[PDB]
Amino acid sequence: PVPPLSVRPAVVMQGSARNQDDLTHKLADIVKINNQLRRNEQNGAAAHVIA
Amino acid sequence: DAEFDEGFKVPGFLFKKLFKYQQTGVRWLWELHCQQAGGILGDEMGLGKTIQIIAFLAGLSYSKIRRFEGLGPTVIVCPTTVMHQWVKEFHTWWPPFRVAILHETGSYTHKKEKLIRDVAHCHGILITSYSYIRLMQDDISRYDWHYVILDEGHKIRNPNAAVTLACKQFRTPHRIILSGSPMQNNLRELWSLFDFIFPGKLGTLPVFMEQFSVPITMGGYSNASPVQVKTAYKCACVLRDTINPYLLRRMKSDVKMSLSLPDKNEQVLFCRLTDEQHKVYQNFVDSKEVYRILNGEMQIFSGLIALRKICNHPDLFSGEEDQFGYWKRSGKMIVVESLLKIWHKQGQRVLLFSQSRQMLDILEVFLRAQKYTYLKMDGTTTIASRQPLITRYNEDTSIFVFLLTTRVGGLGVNLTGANRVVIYDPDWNPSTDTQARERAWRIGQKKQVTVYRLLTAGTIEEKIYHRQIFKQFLTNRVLKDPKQRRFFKSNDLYELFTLTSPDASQSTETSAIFAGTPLASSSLLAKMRARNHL
DNA sequence: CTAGTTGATCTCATATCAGGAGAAGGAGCAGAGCG
DNA sequence: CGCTCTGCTCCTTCTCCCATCCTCTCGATGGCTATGAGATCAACTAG
């Protein structure tokens, strides 16, 4: 379960740079590796790579 | 009427029209239909593969072989640019097939789901686009299709694309692919195509890679240990005979005597970098960005795009006689200047190809700076007006140079009136450049066509061309003959962030690399021990 | 109603040191039945 | 007569917690891959 935006608000700094929450960065890592694992299982990858 | 072994009465008044290889292809297709397996009509372009398919399906319908009294509902998934052609072909060969197109243009004028239902209810011949297979992948696959023909089935070359999954969601045993090249880059595409036509024959893609792809490429390098090359040869032989009865591929060598073919010559010009372009390239290959690429902290892809932009023209990467895209700042544009001037003095007609549309626009601005008349067609032109431009180029001579990228238009748009062709920059896929050169030099080409590939020596472009040749060699080894003289080095081929421009004292890297130029249990055992000693 | 043009929108390619305190597991083992 | 089944002790992880409230300064934080073609569709722009 990925929480809503209220639990991880993207606070705007003095300028326009929108800083993301720690939860959002972590979910970014999770989605990155999840997509990476999904393609590695779908396409050519070694068993140790998938592991 | 010609009759086959089990009884497949292909009509005489169609069968007589086919050529010998076409009749062989119909025989092969019907052998597949008896075995209830699929195949790949891997015959290269121009031989005529739609004629074989309509002839075979027409014979299967008239012969009333049976499930289904004769031929049932079949779906043909082809690119949009050829859909109407397909229906016309049916209507001229075998009229009584109720052929119907699924498209916004179409002819149904009602709900498309009703079209699928009605066509299946009449055992019709239904043509779609790959996008409609992807979008209605749940809807279109409910009406018990009897045949699935993926024309230009190399759209399935990626085992990850949603089109591949939607196309592999069909249930019939009958899967035919009409592709001019089953594989284009590497064996991922061969595996995907074979997973389509015959789900179980080649193993799961991990198994397939670990058994075939890695050993073959490891034996495709000239610094490989002898054991590696021998294993690569053996594994290539195993893949070849495994795919032998399901990939029918014929070249223009055996069938050449039947049809004419004007001679084609090809050169690879090595265009030295201009000193400003050379300085920019050296600054990029010395800047911290490529260092971070070598550290793996940044995506190498952006560096690749940047170096390709630099070799095309500095104004792409960097951003009177000093306006945007001045042709004097890139050596390839110098050579294009010379070739265009000479060819215009010769009265010939030119195709100008480039993978980048931005540098295509730069070339347009350059041509406007000159007085050459020209015509442009790219992805930005509306498709409904693509056919006129080509015709206007092909019919007259008052248009000199036609501008393309390698990947615009339907496959093999008829650009026949051109005489010379120049590929401004190489691509990663050998097949797109092969298609670029093939587009000018097709059936019904009147004059000798020559292709000039423009490279910058010692740069990223030379390595792109090396990769293109390497992939072409891999495809050839898999498809025509395993024994092959090894050209390349593993480290030199893969390291592609350096700059060693030639000084003419030493020869270029390409020329340095290409410097030379029942069984009675004993035949069975003999073949086993023969294959095992390798 | 019918094309034709024009944006949006989406898919697919090619790159390689000055804590402590308690709870739970585990291991060595003494010994008791007991077949 | 050797095996099992305890259940005692000694050690080892392992994990949890460490007063409340308030004021102020001061440093760090900034995330950008590209490009192009095919196809669908939905909105205008004429008819």
Word description of this protein:
This is part of a larger assembly, with chains A (51 residues) and B (534 residues). Chain A has 51 residues and is mainly α. Chain A has helices spanning 22-42, 47-50, and strands spanning 11-12, 18-19. In chain A, strands 1-2 form a two-stranded antiparallel ribbon. In chain A, strand 1 and strand 2 (18-19) form a beta hairpin. The longest helix of chain A has 21 residues, at 22-42. Chain A starts with 10 loop residues before the first strand and ends with a helix. In chain B, helix 18 links the parallel strand 12 (420-423) and strand 13 (449-455). Chain B is 45% helix and 10% strand. The longest helix of chain B is centred in the C-terminal third of the chain and has 20 residues, at 460-479. With 534 residues, chain B is of the alpha/beta class. Chain B contains 22 helices and 13 strands. Chains A and B meet through loops of A and helix 9 of B. Chain B binds a DNA duplex (35 and 47 nucleotides) through residues 79-81, 104, 129-132, 134-135, 155, 157-158, 160-163, 185, 293, 296, 298-306, 308-309, 355-358, 378-379, 382-385, 405, 407-409, 427-429, 432, 464, 467, 494, 496.
List its salient traits.
part of a larger assembly, 2 chains, A: 51 residues, mainly alpha, two-stranded antiparallel ribbon, B: 534 residues, alpha/beta, seven-stranded parallel β-sheet, globular, DNA-binding, DNA excision repair protein ERCC-6 (chain B), DNA-directed RNA polymerase II subunit RPB1 (chain A)
> Order of SSEs of chain A, N→C?
EEHH
What's the helical proportion of residues of chain A?
40-55%
- Count every beta strand of chain B, where a strand is a DSSP E run of 2 or more residues: 13
Number of helices of chain B: 22
Strands in their spatial order, largest beta sheet of chain B: 3-4-2-5-6-1-7
CA-CA gap between termini of chain A: 23 Å
